[model samples]
Target: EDTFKVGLIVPMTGGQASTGKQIDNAIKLYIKKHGDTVAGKKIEVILKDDAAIPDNTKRLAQELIVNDKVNVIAGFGITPAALAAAPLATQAKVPEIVMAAGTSIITERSPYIVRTSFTLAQSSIIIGDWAAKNGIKKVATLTSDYAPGNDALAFFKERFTAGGGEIVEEIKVPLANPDFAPFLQRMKDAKPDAMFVFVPAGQGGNFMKQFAERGLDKSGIKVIGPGDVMDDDLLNSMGDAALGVVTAHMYSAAHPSAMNKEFVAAYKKEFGQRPGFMAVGGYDGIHLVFEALKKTGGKADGDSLIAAMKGMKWESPRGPISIDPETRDIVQNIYIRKVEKVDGELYNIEFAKFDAVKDPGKT
Candidate 1:
C-alpha cells in the first residue's frame, strides 16, 4: 500500500552525466536533511537516465508513468528533452517539474509542467540591465548551436539591443565543440566591447578553458558566461584557468545568507566539495515538493498537487522561492560573479548584485 513515489529522469550517462550526478547528490542530500517520509508514508524516487537524447525522454516517460505508475515526475537536463516529455506527462495527469534549462516552450505547454529554473530570457534580462547600466554598447554572443541557445540569444537581443546595445555577431555551435577559433576569430574581426557566451552542460567548462588558453582573455573583450560556464561543477575541471571569468548565476557556496551558509556546509560535509546553483535548484525543488505532499496529506494526486504547488513559497537554499501561479515558473534571484582566488582556492568571485528575476520571459 506504500505507493508514494517521485519519478526522476535526467541524462546521467552522456554529455550531461556530471550535472545529472550533481542533481542526484543534491536530491539525496534533501531527503537526508528533511526526512523522506511525508505524512507517515515512505517516499521513494524512481530514477531514469535518458542520456540527453530527446527521443529517450518520451520512451522513458511512458515507462515511468504506465509501467512505473509514479505519483509525481521531475528531473530534466535539457530544454528539448523536457519539451518531449511535457505533453505526455500532462496527458497522464502527472505533474512534472523541469529541473534545468528554461526554453520559452515550457510556459506554452499544457497544465502539468512547472519549472524551478530561470528561463533563458529571465537570465538575459538581468544581464541586459547590467550591460545597459554599464553602458556596454557593442556586444557579441556565442550560444549553443540549438533551440535553447537560440531562445537565449533572441531574448538577449531583444532586451540588450532594445536597451540601446547591439549584438554585433552571434556564433552558434554544437554543444560539445572542441575549438572556438572561428567564433573567436569573428569576435576579433568585429571587436565587440564585450561577449556573452553559452556553453551549457559539459561544453561550458571546455569553452572557458579553451578561451583562456587561446589568449582570448588578452583580447580585452569583457567576457561574461552564463552561470552554467562558471558553475561549481566546472570550477575544478576548469582549474586555474577558470579564475576571473565573469558570469550570471543564482546561488553560491560563498553566499552570506544563513540558509545558504548551512546549505554550503551541509553540501561540503556530504560531498567534500562546494554546492553549485544546480544543486540549489534541486534542493529547493525537493523542499517545494514536500510542501505540496504535506498539503495533500501525502496523497498528492496530479490536479491537487498542481493546485497546491502554485504560488507555493519555501525558505529555499537560494533565499526565498515562490512558484508563479500563472506560469508554474519559479521566481528566483540571479547574481553576477567573477572567478577569483580566496585563501588559495578559486571561487566564483562575486562582485556585483542583481535582484531576483520573476519569469521575465512571459510575453
Candidate 2:
C-alpha cells in the first residue's frame, strides 16, 4: 500500500522550543483526530528538529525533501526559519507550508510556498489603520533584528507615514538580547505617543519587563504589536507588565464566537490548558494539507497539492482563509486587541477588527 507522508520542521530544541512543541503536538493530534488515514493509506508525519536556527533549518530541509522523500514540508514559529527553508522547498519541488510568521518575504520569495500565516505587510495595514483612527500622531518602535521584525516594522512605518502618522524613532534590538537598556534609553529620548514592538518567543517576556520598568506608561507611550508579545505563554511570564498594551491577533482565548469556543474547549482538553495562537496556526496548517489532499485524492504529490491550496478555504478558529493563487498566502482579517483586565482575568480583548484584506499592495 502506498503511504502518505508530510515532513514537519520546527525549532524543537532552541529558544522557540515551546511553540515548536505545541506545533508538534497539534500535528500529531491532527493525524489522530483526522482518522489517522486518508485514501486508505496510513499518513506518516516526519518530525525534524531545526533547533530554531537558519543553518540547521536549511540542512534539515535538504535531508527531509531529498533523502527522506517526504510528500511536503511544513512548520515554523519564527520567520527566519520559515524563510530559511523556503528556497530549499522550491529548489526541491516540494511544497512548504509556513504555519506562522507574518513576515512579508514569505510570499515575495517562493513559488512552492503556501503560508497559513498572513504577511507582516498585512499586519502593518491593520496597525496603520488603527493609528489613523485613534488620532495617534507620532510613535516609536522596537523590534528584534530579524527578517520578521524588519519587514513588519518597515511596512508599518510606510503605512503609518502614508496615513500622515509619524514614527519618530525606530529601534531594532538584537534577536534574543537580554539587555534592553540602550533600547529603553533611546525610546525615552524619542518619547512618542505610542510604541510598537515585535518580540516573539523568549525575548517577548524580557522586552515587556524592561519596557514596563523603564516607565513606559509614565512616558505616555502606548505599546502595541502583532500580539505574539502578548501570547498565552508570554502573558503567563509577563503578568501585569502586559496590561494596557494592544496587539493584532487572529484568535484568542477571549473570542466569543461559538465555533471558537468549541475549538478552545477541544484544544484545552488535549493540551491541559488553553491553546495559543501558534497552536491554532498548526491546526490550520495540517487542515490545509488535508484540504489539498482531498483535492488530489491523497496522492501526496508536490505540484498537485500546491495547486489545490490556491483559493482553498479552511474554516478555522481564527477565521476562514481565502487562499490567494499567486502568492499562496491566505488573505484574511487581522484583529486589533486591547490588553485589559476583564472580570478578574487579564487578556487581550478584541476591541477592533480589520476588514478582510486581500494582498497588501494596491487592490
Mind giving the per-residue lDDT tens digits that candidate 2 earns over 260-288? 78877776788776667777778888888
| Inter-residue clash pairs, candidate 2 | 102-120
Report lDDT (Cα) of residue 49, candidate 1. 92
Backbone Cα, N, C clashes tallied per candidate: 3, 1
Candidate 1 residue pairs in clash (backbone atoms < 3 Å) = 244-339, 333-356, 338-349
Q: lDDT by residue for model 1 over 290-343, one digit each (tens)?
A: 888888877768998889899897767666778889878887777777788877
lDDT of every predicted structure (CA atoms): 0.76, 0.76
Per-model TM-score, in order, reads 0.94, 0.92
What ranges in model 2 sit over 4 Å off?
A: 361-363
